[PDB]
Design a protein around this ligand. Sequence first.
Ligand SMILES: O=C1CC[C@H](N2C(=O)c3ccccc3C2=O)C(=O)N1
Ligand SMILES: [Zn+2]
Length: 112
Amino acid sequence: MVLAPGASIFRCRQCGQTISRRDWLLPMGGDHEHVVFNPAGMIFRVWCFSLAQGLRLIGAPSGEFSWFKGYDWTIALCGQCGSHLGWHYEGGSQPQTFFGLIKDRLAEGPAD
Ligand SMILES: O=C1CC[C@H](N2C(=O)c3ccccc3C2=O)C(=O)N1
Ligand SMILES: [Zn+2]
């Protein structure tokens, strides 16, 4: 516990929608940070979270190109502005589900 913490909540960088919390970071494979690339060669610094809110999960899951063995992904947009914030992963084991969010698309700041 700290008084007046400034690194508590992650919001959408583009609009401020509440998305996640530092307390919910999830060390997948021993690290909450996973640096990965997609088939279009884009590099993402992905932070894994157990939980997130304020997103909209688009479509149905796919296992194609999944960065996390045993998980299928759905695109996760900011539910307010539509910014692509990351992916929701499901269908796996321990945990069954989690979120992989793009670190530089979030803003971190004080609690609400
Ligand atoms: O775990 C994942 C999530 C999605 C992701 N990915 C993308 O970022 C992407 C962009 C364009 C076409 C196809 C893909 C897809 O598989 C990817 O490569 N792995
Ligand atoms: Zn947003």
